[PDB]
Design a protein that fits this description.
The structure is a homotetramer. By secondary structure, chain A is an alpha/beta fold. The first copy, chain A, contains 14 helices and 26 strands. Chain A has 2 domains: 1-18 and 233-421, Enolpyruvate transferase domain (UDP-n-acetylglucosamine1-carboxyvinyl-transferase, Chain, Alpha-beta prism), CATH 3.65.10.10; 21-231, Enolpyruvate transferase domain (UDP-n-acetylglucosamine1-carboxyvinyl-transferase, Chain), CATH 3.65.10.10. In chain A, strand 16 and strand 17 (282-286) form a beta hairpin. Chain A binds chain B through residues 86, 90, 113-118, 120-123, 140-143, 332-333, 335-340, 342-345, 350-352, 364-369, 371, 388, and chain B through 86, 90, 112-118, 120-123, 140-144, 332-333, 335-340, 342-345, 350-352, 364-369, 371, 388. The structure holds uridine-diphosphate-2(N-acetylglucosaminyl) butyric acid (EPU) (4 copies), (2R)-2-(phosphonooxy)propanoic acid (4 copies), chloride ion (2 copies) and magnesium ion (MG) (4 copies). Chain D: Its EC number is 2.5.1.7.
Chain lengths: 421, 421, 421, 422
């Protein structure tokens, strides 16, 4: 119903505060189930995926308490139904993150098996085999992953991920924290959300070492004592606002972030002709009104260029000077945004997993449709440098991946407004 | 929005009547814009894409005279607004078919540039380039393809398609019908709907030779007179009901159709172990209660295996004996239905354009979700064999590509029912 | 140990005669095995693959009249051995073309199963299956395809090609020419050499209709009598010399050719900036000293852009102005020539089946290596516009696909010389 | 003209063999001797043609090595004359590009022939150049040579980020940074074991390399690197090949002088195939107990994921396994030459893009085949052990480049293989 009308031309200039990592808050909220008492999770971003995670906890019997804005107190001792119903899992496949801790703490779980997702192929085979490696008897029946740990809880084991998985590493890490004995995860996801999740379990009395590297070692404990924690900054949001400034040729000082969690993104911004300055908890980018130069990029697991920034750089190459090759290795058909940009005058040829972008002088305003919680931000970025008005429909997707995108751009001098239907 | 509830286990047996081709009716209806008098189009299918095309004519000032048993009289001389609004084109990209004949008959047209489509990469550069080859000056602005022909009208020319395009051939074919001089379409699409359009334009007075081969030659004319013309049978609908019998191990006679327009589909049904007989206007498949045998297939332009039948054969391979390799060369990442079938207990490994389907003995009923007008029929087909109830949501997609799917399956003895919201 | 030493910088200018189609001569020669009397093939190109095909006839016991250069007389009635040995088949996989006619004419054959080729995936499964569909029992043993036709010869049948195959269509076409009754080749290869093969078999008394279209209906005959037929002109050779003049900015009049067998290639040369003029059997190209413009291309089955010209246009894009996207669909990783051009200063990024060629002002001479009988001609072309000398090694590959390439370039004024050792 | 291999299948393997030094570690370690200014001794070198080729490259530069003791080659780069890696040797081995980094950092300049094409797939070297340019070295590709020239005062350290994981790419910049003034930080670096072994070799010569093994390597430059005796690590690819050799035949084998931690992905896939495996400080013991292997799915990727050098070997395993398995290549998407040679031996393998859908059969049939890949062609030797009758493999000069006398080791396990010079 809600829409965003954006008038291009405006040069961005200002500073905004970054929200907590969406992909760190979800696994940490799921990790609260491992605790044996009330746990307060701070620096949460005000976006819909956090709200869907709160509903899920409601459906299970847990009643979250908001002591302050961007903060939730979770008490897992009031849990009644060990079920992640399909009515909610169908809306957010990240709900599967509850499977691991729920099985390792309470002994069983019935999580709905995720269906299809527009982005591409996103099976959860590794999530299931990882829990089986720890003795759990799992079966897919009636659309649910009916898991049940063996008597005496889960057992520690050496499990190898054939493919690097972020949420896969997270489920098995959480389960390994309460399993009996030592668990060793091989070819683990090295994303900072994983590290931030480990630091949460360790704060609670967990024995996790290796997070950040390909080999995570977990020494099981019988019970994780409650302890408060503040979620890390969102590396994707941070990057998205740096590109917003870059695309428009203006400047921005992104605050409350971390420069060490997006080296690849900052390095691509320098190749495009941007000047970057950084502090301990802030980043400052300034193009000085220069038309960027096309850059090539290849998505891959962290610390490589993240796929959640792939779309954002296509909107940069769209008005750049020269040809840029934006390649996908994670999700090879994540280019819906490209076909919407065609309407705005962007010249891009997509062949398989590669998007060849030919930079034109400027874009043209046209009504577009959002369809990806992170990639559709590129439509918001392209609209900022498009002659005329750009009406972006189906923004509920954008609301899932970004905290008040309209308000943050308005502080940077952007001419953008929300239009409720 | 409505839903479809299906109880599997029943072995289908009966006979139905095939409707008019959706992909033939769409260009044939668009082709009525070329007429210089009232034209009647028969055997139209009762599905939503046709309803959207009628609305498109409504926007342009034409008020199609619908009648009982699906017949539409169109007098294009009452046209008023030479525009195909984005509000209608965003719901169906096949609306671009009006560009060609509208530029050739009236000298100008403003048709919204199609946006993104979940299926995959579907650009329209060849549509635009083909009209540019005939002297028309085109420019993309405000999200619209603003086409203008010269004073004398469109001039015939030799145009070569770099990629085989069904709707591309149709647009350029229709434009060349009123153009001055001969036009030769090289590397043209050979689909039977292209031939059916050619024969429709010939009934109106046109002179189109070669339709159905790699080269189409058009000797342009001044005007096109009235004509009454029934469209061809739908080959995808025909193939879909043949699989419905094959998955359930039953029989089905398909009336009012044509066996010559789907030799590839019938051949893959022989490999699966199906007994097939054909007549002048009918096809009869009968599995004799046998479990299907796995089959490997590869989608390609007609007469190769059609991409619109790719999903239906995955349903067939899901309960087949052995492993089957289902490959896509047209829409490489068109496998959303595979992840929905995972919920029903199917075992399919998807890697890029290949779907390795490992057949199991039985599927399990569970709530699924449709997303593709033709491919989502596979979910209905998988539900016919699965154990228990299968609740299919978002059936408006199915209602676009198939004429009352529940009423036809009901004649074959299937437990299927429409449940409104 | 032969090598070509080219000195770049010369602007080509002249005219040359095109040889007979190499890929038409091979199957037409193989078709002579079907005959029941002396058959003479004319207009043969003097290249190694024809020599290798003649050695095979020698090993089979046939003593062909090799008096004349451009023609050969063959009497299959004097055959002594129904075998295509591994010693020869390993050097040329096109040797499999003798399988079909040998099985149909002599009731059995044992042809070595081709091994790997550095180009890409080239299995011969459609060849084996097509013969099996005609009632022939076939097994693979000792690295040989041992086929055996039933008593009364092969039976005609409807056979569907899952993938468009040139040599596949040619084998089943030849076998069906002597089979009992009608045969229907569904989704046949439309390449001009298949048409040239059909007309040859028809000249011997056969009845092959639909050659050049997607469906070929062959009515088998009992005996194929003598005929004196001249093969068609080589379309790939034509295109290579047209590019030779296009890269050097010169001109060239190609004689004894046909413009209708390479419309896709002629169209891409116009998009590059070359002025083309044609006739019944000639094609004249002239760049008039202009630097070409970058062009995109997609290889596919004829009449689409041929894969045997994909490398030739990569050298053209190297010297071109702008970025050119060269895409492969037949052999998705046939880019060895690209990595050889990096040595000559060419800026080409390769990702899967797509080559992003970024044009530069000039190439630098350096010793390179040939690996493909058709694509390595691009190394010879790049050397024409490279500064200094370019020493090409392993030219035996080029001698297979081109009739004394240096002598024809000498006619056009190119500084090219052959030096053994 | 050249050697061949004749293999008679059916024999169940049983025995033990000693693993040689890592080819891909011995190659960069030898090139790293150029950084030193003294008599550096390198032990445990494998006897394979590529080590001989690297020695020839040193000879053309004026550095003839002296063998101190068995398998211990002592190199002293102070006697170097010419700073050029000729095309005549680089065209035969593209790994020769590894001398560029150290030759530029120590001596100031270098001319290394730009490698051409490799049948395996797309293997450009743009990151090797981009990394040296990030350290101030001006480079140009003229006459087919990478004419690199460092600025006065040596190379300057820099924070270079690899857009794609490159093993040899990570090694060249690591060696260059070893002597470059200032700190160098390689981001998204290759995590392969040979990178770690190389880092420990440079540290043994007085270097300062941290984070080798992890995706972030920090290097601190020094004035010079003194002499030190060092032994190269075991070859993980050789280890895996012989573990499959025992597995395809339903037999067993103990692998000595190796390391299980350097091929976890390989050992897990063998357990999924139904192989009983035991490990220790420096050995691996596998035994199929005569059971037919189970079909397994694979996905090649940068270490520690399943290595692409082991992809071909597991196809020969699936070729005779129970069920259908998918072998996927993310690195070299068209590295399947061996598959078409396996078809000749009776294997059922459908290739589409980078996926090899292997459907297993009771057994293979012997047939003459041809090798064309220094590592992947070992699969032809493996599939020949389970092929009825004789199998004549040709162009084995490729196999000699990546394996130390493959016939004498299979003969130690009881395999009916023999080398035929005819
Ligand atoms: C799109 C989002 O961000 C995504 C982000 O794009 C991806 C990749 O960086 O990693 C997270 O997803 P994820 O954990 O489901 O994805 P991953 O598991 O890393 O998948 C990577 C690759 O591994 C494959 N994969 C994954 C899991 C599995 O069991 N098997 C498997 O084969 C997938 O096919 C995919 O191609 C983020 N989501 C969360 C909740 O952490 C989002 O916020 O929803
Ligand atoms: C999905 C539908 O059916 C589809 C059917 O799947 C396909 C393939 O057979 O051909 C029709 O689409 P279409 O005309 O857009 O498809 P094609 O034009 O043949 O596209 C084939 C390929 O060519 C490429 N392509 C197409 C047009 C173009 O200008 N440029 C281009 O590069 C596309 O990327 C695609 O990969 C049907 N639609 C209609 C209205 O005729 C539907 O009912 O909407
Ligand atoms: C390389 C040469 O030219 C080639 C030329 O590149 C191609 C494409 O037009 O068609 C001929 O090969 P071919 O007939 O072996 O190749 P095709 O059969 O067309 O193969 C096309 C595609 O179909 C697939 N294919 C073909 C046959 C088969 O049984 N199975 C199969 O999967 C292949 O994987 C390939 O990707 C020419 N050769 C001859 C002797 O006619 C040469 O000079 O030998
Ligand atoms: C085949 C051999 O082993 C190979 C082994 O297969 C590969 C992969 O693990 O890593 C080494 O090659 P390499 O270092 O040249 O390969 P990598 O640099 O890792 O290349 C991996 C991928 O990165 C890409 N790549 C690499 C470098 C570069 O500058 N740009 C680039 O795009 C390539 O296209 C390739 O697809 C081994 N060789 C040596 C001497 O260390 C051999 O012994 O020759
Ligand atoms: C993808 C984004 O999955 P999700 O919505 O997060 O469950 C989708 O549905 O498109
Ligand atoms: C695809 C299915 O195209 P269309 O609806 O026909 O415009 C989509 O939009 O998802
Ligand atoms: C390719 C070109 O196949 P062929 O020689 O024609 O059998 C090769 O072997 O390199
Ligand atoms: C590959 C293997 O590279 P190299 O020979 O090692 O330079 C090849 O040439 O095929
Ligand atoms: Cl697609
Ligand atoms: Cl590991
Ligand atoms: Mg969703
Ligand atoms: Mg739609
Ligand atoms: Mg060859
Ligand atoms: Mg080589």
């Amino acid at each position: 119903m809600d829409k965003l009308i954006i008038t291009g031309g405006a040069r961005l200039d200002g500073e905004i505060r970054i929200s907590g990592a969406k992909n760190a808050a979800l696994p940490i909220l799921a990790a609260t189930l491992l605790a044996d008492g009330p746990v307060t999770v701070g620096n949460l971003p005000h976006l819909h995926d956090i709200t869907t995670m709160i509903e899920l906890f409601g459906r299970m019997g847990i009643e979250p308490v908001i002591d302050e804005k961007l903060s939730v107190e979770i008490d897992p001792r009031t849990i009644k139904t060990l079920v992640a119903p399909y009515e909610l899992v169908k809306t957010m496949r990240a709900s599967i993150l509850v499977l691991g801790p729920m099985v390792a703490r309470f002994g069983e779980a019935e999580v709905a098996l995720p269906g299809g997702c527009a982005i591409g192929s996103r099976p959860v085979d590794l999530h299931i085999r990882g829990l089986e490696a720890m003795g759990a008897k799992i079966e897919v029946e009636g659309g649910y992953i009916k898991a049940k740990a063996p008597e005496g809880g889960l057992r520690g084991a050496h499990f190898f991920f054939d493919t690097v998985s972020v949420t896969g590493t997270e489920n098995i890490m959480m389960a390994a924290a309460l399993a009996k004995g030592r668990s060793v995860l091989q070819n683990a996801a090295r994303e900072p959300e994983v590290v931030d999740l480990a630091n949460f379990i360790n704060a609670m009395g967990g024995n996790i070492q290796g997070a950040g590297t390909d080999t995570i070692t977990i020494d099981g404990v019988e019970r994780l004592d409650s302890a408060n924690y503040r979620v890390m900054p969102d590396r994707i949001e941070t990057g998205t606002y740096l590109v917003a400034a870059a695309v428009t040729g203006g400047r921005v000082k992104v605050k409350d972030t971390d420069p060490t969690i997006l080296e690849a993104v900052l390095e691509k911004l320098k190749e495009a002709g941007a000047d970057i300055n950084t502090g301990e908890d802030w980043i400052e980018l300034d193009m000085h009104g220069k038309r960027p130069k096309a850059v090539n990029l290849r998505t891959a697991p962290y610390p490589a260029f993240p796929t959640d920034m792939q779309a954002q750089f296509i909107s940069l190459n769209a008005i750049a000077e020269g040809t840029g090759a934006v390649i996908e290795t994670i999700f090879e058909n994540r280019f819906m945004h490209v076909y919407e940009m065609h309407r705005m005058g962007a010249q891009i040829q997509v062949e398989g997993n590669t998007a060849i972008v030919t930079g034109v002088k400027a874009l043209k305003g046209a009504p577009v449709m959002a369809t990806d919680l992170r990639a559709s931000a590129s439509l918001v970025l392209s609209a900022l440098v498009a002659e005329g008005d750009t009406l972006i429909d189906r923004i509920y997707h954008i609301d899932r991946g970004y905290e008040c995108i309209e308000e943050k751009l308005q502080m940077l001098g952007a001419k953008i407004r929300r239009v409720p239907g």
